[PDB]
Amino acid sequence: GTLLQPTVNKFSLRVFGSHKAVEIEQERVKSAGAWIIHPYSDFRFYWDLIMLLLMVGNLIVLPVGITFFKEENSPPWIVFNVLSDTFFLLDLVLNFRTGIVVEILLAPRAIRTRYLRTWFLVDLISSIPVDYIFLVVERALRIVRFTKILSLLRLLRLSRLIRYIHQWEEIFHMTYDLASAVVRIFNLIGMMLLLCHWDGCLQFLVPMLQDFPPDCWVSINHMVNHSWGRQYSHALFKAMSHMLCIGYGQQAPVGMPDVWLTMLSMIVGATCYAMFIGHATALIQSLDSSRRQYQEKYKQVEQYMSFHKLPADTRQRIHEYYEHRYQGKMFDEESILGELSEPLREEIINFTCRGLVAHMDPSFVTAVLTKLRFEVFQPGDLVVREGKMYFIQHGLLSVLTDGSYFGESVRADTYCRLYSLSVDHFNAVLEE
Amino acid sequence: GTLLQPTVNKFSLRVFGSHKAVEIEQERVKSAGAWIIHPYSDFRFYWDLIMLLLMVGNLIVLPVGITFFKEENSPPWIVFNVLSDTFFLLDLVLNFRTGIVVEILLAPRAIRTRYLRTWFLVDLISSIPVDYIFLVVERALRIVRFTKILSLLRLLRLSRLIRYIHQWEEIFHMTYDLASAVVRIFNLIGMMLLLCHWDGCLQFLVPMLQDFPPDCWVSINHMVNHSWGRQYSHALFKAMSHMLCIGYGQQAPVGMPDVWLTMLSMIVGATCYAMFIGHATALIQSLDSSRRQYQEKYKQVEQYMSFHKLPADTRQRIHEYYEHRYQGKMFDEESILGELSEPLREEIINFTCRGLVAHMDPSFVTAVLTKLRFEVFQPGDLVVREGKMYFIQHGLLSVLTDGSYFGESVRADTYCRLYSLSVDHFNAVLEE
Amino acid sequence: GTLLQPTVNKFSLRVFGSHKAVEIEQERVKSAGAWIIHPYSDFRFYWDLIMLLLMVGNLIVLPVGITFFKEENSPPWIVFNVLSDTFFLLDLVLNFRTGIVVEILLAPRAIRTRYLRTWFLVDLISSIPVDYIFLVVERALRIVRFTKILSLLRLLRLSRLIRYIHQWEEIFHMTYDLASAVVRIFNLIGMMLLLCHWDGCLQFLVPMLQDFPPDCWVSINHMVNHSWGRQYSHALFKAMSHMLCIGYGQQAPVGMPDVWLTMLSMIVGATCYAMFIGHATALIQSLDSSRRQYQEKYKQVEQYMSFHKLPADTRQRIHEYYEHRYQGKMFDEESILGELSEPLREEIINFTCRGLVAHMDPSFVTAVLTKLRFEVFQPGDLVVREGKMYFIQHGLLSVLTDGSYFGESVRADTYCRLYSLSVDHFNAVLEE
Amino acid sequence: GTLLQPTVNKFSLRVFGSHKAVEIEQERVKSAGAWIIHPYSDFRFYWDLIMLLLMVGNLIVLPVGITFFKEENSPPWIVFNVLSDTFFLLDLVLNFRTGIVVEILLAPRAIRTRYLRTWFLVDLISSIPVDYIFLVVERALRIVRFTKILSLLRLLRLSRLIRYIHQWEEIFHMTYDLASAVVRIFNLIGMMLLLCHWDGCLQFLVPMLQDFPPDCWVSINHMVNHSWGRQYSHALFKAMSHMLCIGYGQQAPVGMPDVWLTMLSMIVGATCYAMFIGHATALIQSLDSSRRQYQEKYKQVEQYMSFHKLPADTRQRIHEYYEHRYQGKMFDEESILGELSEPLREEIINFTCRGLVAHMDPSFVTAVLTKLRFEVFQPGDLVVREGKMYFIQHGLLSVLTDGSYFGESVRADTYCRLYSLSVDHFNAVLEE
Ligand SMILES: COc1ccc(CCN2CCC[C@H](CN3CCc4cc(OC)c(OC)cc4CC3=O)C2)cc1OC
Numbered sequence A, B, C, D: 001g002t003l004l005q006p007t008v009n010k011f012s013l014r015v016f017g018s019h020k021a022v023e024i025e026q027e028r029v030k031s032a033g034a035w036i037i038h039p040y041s042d043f044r045f046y047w048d049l050i051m052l053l054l055m056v057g058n059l060i061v062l063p064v065g066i067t068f069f070k071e072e073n074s075p076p077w078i079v080f081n082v083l084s085d086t087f088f089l090l091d092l093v094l095n096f097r098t099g100i101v102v103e104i105l106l107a108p109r110a111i112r113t114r115y116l117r118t119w120f121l122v123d124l125i126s127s128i129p130v131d132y133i134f135l136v137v138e139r140a141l142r143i144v145r146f147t148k149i150l151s152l153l154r155l156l157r158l159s160r161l162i163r164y165i166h167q168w169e170e171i172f173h174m175t176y177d178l179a180s181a182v183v184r185i186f187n188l189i190g191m192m193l194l195l196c197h198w199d200g201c202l203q204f205l206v207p208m209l210q211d212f213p214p215d216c217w218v219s220i221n222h223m224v225n226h227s228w229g230r231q232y233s234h235a236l237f238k239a240m241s242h243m244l245c246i247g248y249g250q251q252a253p254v255g256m257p258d259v260w261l262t263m264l265s266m267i268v269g270a271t272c273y274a275m276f277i278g279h280a281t282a283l284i285q286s287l288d289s290s291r292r293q294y295q296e297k298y299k300q301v302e303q304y305m306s307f308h309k310l311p312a313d314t315r316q317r318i319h320e321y322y323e324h325r326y327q328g329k330m331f332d333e334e335s336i337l338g339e340l341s342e343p344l345r346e347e348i349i350n351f352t353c354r355g356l357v358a359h360m361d362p363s364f365v366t367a368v369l370t371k372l373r374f375e376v377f378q379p380g381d382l383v384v385r386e387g388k389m390y391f392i393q394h395g396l397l398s399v400l401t402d403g404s405y406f407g408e409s410v411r412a413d414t415y416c417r418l419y420s421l422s423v424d425h426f427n428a429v430l431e432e
């Protein structure tokens, strides 16, 4: 009976904190006197995993089944509709009982009023079979067309599909690290494919209800008596050619329901393609930002060069210095060491340094190693004046190899990475 | 008589300041000797609310009424034009008297010269009925076509509609918080729909004035003697197919007014669709910026990892530390507490802290609570050396539960959020 | 004779500095022994103003004059070509003598070698009349077509037009403040219009050289014997329909020069329209950046709210505080006062402050006024504890009106903007 | 035998460091007991330079050779296929032996398992001639069509081409400074051209296998018995018209393989063009960032002006100050001097300063020159009060010329750039 309560996962510990907050939430669920269903429990997961599959199945199969087929009295179609109505009614019954993340777990007052205020009507319309009631209660062709238009009320399950998809993918940013633009662009691709699939069925459906006039494209292309696969292929081609702004037929369209459907599909396709270009741009601009911020910083540097009118050899020397200091990449070594915790910084220092001070109290050694600084030099650029202590990591130094010190005229022969521990910090560590 | 003066609203207090500045502005309006109209008063609001509705009504109805209908001597059309001319003349009379935000409320000198210099001519042209004067003063078909082209001068009210819309939506950024890109993109959508509606009427209007030559599309499609709804539908379809860059008919266009109108509508549609893509991109890039700045910062962090060639276990340990420190979100807790005022920071501290120091002078307690710091640790990462005081918010610590202190070998067993009050700040508070 | 030397303008003082650097540059021009022409002088300006007009005139008139007209032996055409050849030869002669901004004013060595290395050949080809030489030196229709293809070598003046336009608009960023994206987008619009105008003439030119085969569109549309205006209109419509990716005719194109010209114009139009979308996006993203950085900062603030799980009343109180502190706008008052000079800051302080300290040594007053700080409070938020001095700019305070002080239980009744001069800074000013 | 080992280049010194790390890597390659091939050596470079040329040659020639030609038994075709199979088998043999940058140079364990896990199958399929085996082992037209479909398995060499191109261009960001967006956009242009070239051959290939039905476009346009150049031109035109979303023929397509190929090419072309717009936008936004950050900063400055309601003369004075301080360009002179090394800063100071202190111990002079600060003033803005030392670089000062000092009422007549060395720093240098 603990399936209604939230368990102890990585997600529950990231949301609530320690195990004590999770046990407080479990006692809070068990304290409201009901069979209350917590929205992070396993039961909602196992239920919505079934419901998303049934939603995708219905939203793909139902327009093709309504429009293209002739006799709607086949047995597996009726079985399919009855089972879909049963599950989408039980999901409404459980939506009476679930918790709402704003977590409002008060069953008799908060959940009922919040569900009746926001999303009861759309789920109630999309749940029950409306057409079969009118068939039991009740010029037969007008009745059949009216029942087809009533049976197209099943497509209001998209408002539930969007809600459950947004809930699960809002959960799954915390269990796993995900790029946001990828999630947004695949959500948009799914929406675009679903809209194109609906426009195909709609552009066959509208000449269908008029008993195929001689002006429509179906009668012109002489394709009334083919199979449903051929008709679906041509209708989907027509819908995709209107959606991607192509230009379909020989003539301009003649009938009045053709013109307005054409214009509607053109507007929907143009807006969807504009949002697709926007998501593609937002995804491309976040691939190599570390190689872009360095470029902007070097633009500012050469602007500083141009403001003071420096000679050309000095400018190419600055260029070589930044190439061998940052290596085409932007990072701030002060703030990164500022943000971290202390023994993890001790680990990073014990990896990088603390092997160069092997020659000549461990806590004294760690304090000296924390008191260091990183420097990059250049050949010809001599560092000492005749009349601050260094260590050598790389490069050549003439007055040597990797690893030495200058105990208190030294010229750099190549690119050298050095360290420094200048005597004020050393005296502070001696005081410690 | 106080309707001409600005009242005391949320907007007036955000603009001018206290009530004293508002009373100074009211005395300034009452001191200029006139019936001067202040541009933030209620009278301009109640006037422009009527004028925007009349502008939308005229700019939708008038091209359809001029082009498609045959006899323009129906009585309600003349009544509609007379009432529109009356209101758009009275609006000119009141635009002589209004104040101008640059607020220049000097009536006889500043307002008259500024209005005559900038926008008197366009409002004067779009105000008066030009066609009826030529009809009273004055080959009859050329006269009727000339009066239609003169009656198309009513469409210079768009320059007033743009001005009033920009004034009100510049006001309504301060009464309510609004995203800027939403306002920009709905302004562009309104402009695009209005331009498409005008291109439809224009592409029926140009074959209309030539007594329908046999080369034009109206004579080819055999649609001279249909109703005006059918003709408007086909003309709007042709205009939208040129605007969205489709490709309309079987043949290339033949007549010379067809080719240049076609090219003009193609260029206008291409530029409008490019600006729509630009606004859509600018709106998409401002949805999840807090989830993007964290991504860029972590790119810089892993670049810092790659610059010093750290081992893989240390890199995944940094990754886990940032996941459980920032939780996929960028914020700077130092600058946010820097920007705020002092007792509001005392409120935030009294909510978060000041319950953990419940065990063991209230001002002393508030000073100690302001002297705290926030820390996040990791399991295995022990924090103390044998031979600074902490508090526990979450996690487990072995040598415990949530809430304890280390009064002056402690190992973190899980993710722990701790506090710190190191003895220098404590001695400063003891000095206070 | 001083027209060859740079004068004293706003631009010369912004580039070189004081008048002494300008006089050094004038002596440098007069010291190189030549009639050397400095590239910032008035003579190059007055010369290039003529040359840009002749370039636009030639690059518009010459393709229409070559392709559509039949007899090329009219007198004003020959006069026009002779005068154009004369001016574009004299411009080459002066390009031997001008200075080069890299300013290299050394005449006999630097300028000649740099001009012969980079851009001598293209200007030499586009300068001289090539076709008339072949006409004097030399199946007549092949000769006429060959002279037309040789006379199309005049269109290599675009490489000079681009160079002079970039030089002048690089100059005119410093004389006047200009948005960069506006300059870029109008340069692109000019290039796109010129390319479309060339594609029209080219798509009439290619069927022209083949003596109008029956497969081409000119023979199909029966438009060989119309005037040149009709043919230019249809050719430009065909070129613009290929460029904006429309779909032109009934059939697919049949001949082989039609297909490759069609594909070439489609590729050029697609790339130009993509760069136009890019420039439009870059222009839109730089209109309301100050209203966007505030939005991003408030996203970070509400993220900081969500990280610590604050109550709702505190969150809306932070929201009201930022609305009445920054007013939907981002600025940093510390760094702006950091960047400025000292007496200008004294001017800003003497405007804002120094009227509130009117009640109760002027240098002492200026030091106290520099030692102030700006604060914003909130109603209910009382500021003093029973048992730092303030000034009042706005709001109401109960224990008052605008302008008072607290000389060393005060409750804010409304939004209050206050000042502060806490006693350490006051003691430092007393020490001064 | 040292060609398998990495040599000493600029790239090897930038990657590994000094010469000692390179010699350690050479001893590491020579210590694994094999003929192991290091992935940065010269041998992989000289091998992949041949392999990229063979890949481009095969991926251009093979679809045109399979589809359009009739008899595939010509001798140079068989020689070409045999040589291509030989080289792409030897490349597999060497891919067994190469090192893998993750550098894993362990031959018998790491490389074999990593290559068998990731990319053995695709290279094995694309290496061997599959069709000739079925021809040796084995209604003849079905056999010929089946061998053509088997011989189209050679096009899985694109997965190797992408890998080698990404490896070399990841190497060549470090040998030379390159803009990233240029590399990305030319990679995308190459991919788009290759996909269009494949769609042309595919849209001729599909009617080819059906023995040219009368519904297809080849039989309609009466182009079965032309040469292969004409057929390739029309097929590539059809593929490019579907890819750029044009609208190709008179009728809608009739056959079922036509419709789905048409829709597939439309979707691929739309996605490629959207990514091209994204790369073009990302390239345009990185051209003039230094002229954009100044614009954003000045927006913040004028917002700070509007927040405090400053007079207009003060606002234009701030505008003139920023124009003559930053010159339309953003840079931070403190952080740039912070990032650099010390003797290079001494070089920059010795260029800019140290000529103005020529009048009135060299180390003392360098310390005073490091203790300076840069200031910009304005005419009318007098700087001294009657009752800090300066130097003059430009401008005029009345109580002069360029270069003077104020040894401890001076009015600036023009724009002046000055220096400062205020007495605390001078006393510190005297202490040094
Ligand atoms: C070291 O431990 C491991 C680390 C990493 C891994 C690899 C695990 N992988 C990490 C990336 C996410 C992926 C699956 N995922 C989640 C489920 C889901 C469901 C959706 O339907 C609502 C959805 O809607 C768009 C989007 C998504 C997003 C999504 O992609 C699982 C395995 C590990 O060990 C097993």
Ligand SMILES: COc1ccc(CCN2CCC[C@H](CN3CCc4cc(OC)c(OC)cc4CC3=O)C2)cc1OC
Pocket: B165, B168, B169, B172, B176, B183, B186
């Ligand atoms: C707690 O107090 C409340 C807080 C919040 C609310 C919700 C109030 N809502 C907040 C958002 C704006 C909206 C209406 N709005 C303003 C009027 C207008 C007119 C225009 O024509 C010129 C226009 O042109 C584009 C654009 C707009 C923008 C616009 O959308 C009103 C109610 C509250 O209590 C009643």
Ligand SMILES: COc1ccc(CCN2CCC[C@H](CN3CCc4cc(OC)c(OC)cc4CC3=O)C2)cc1OC
Pocket: C165, C168, C169, C172, C176, C183, C186
């Ligand atoms: C208070 O003093 C004043 C302040 C301000 C003004 C308004 C003066 N205005 C300021 C904006 C620029 C404009 C003209 N301009 C320069 C000439 C040019 C030539 C080009 O051809 C190469 C070009 O190529 C794209 C682009 C441009 C850009 C361009 O627009 C002149 C007047 C004032 O007093 C007179």
Ligand SMILES: COc1ccc(CCN2CCC[C@H](CN3CCc4cc(OC)c(OC)cc4CC3=O)C2)cc1OC
Pocket: D165, D168, D169, D172, D176, D183, D186
């Ligand atoms: C002062 O010393 C010099 C400084 C500068 C120079 C100019 C040298 N130049 C600098 C820019 C890169 C260019 C060639 N380059 C590298 C090779 C390659 C191969 C590719 O195939 C995989 C590729 O795939 C997209 C992309 C690229 C990128 C690319 O453009 C060489 C010369 C110098 O002296 C000789």
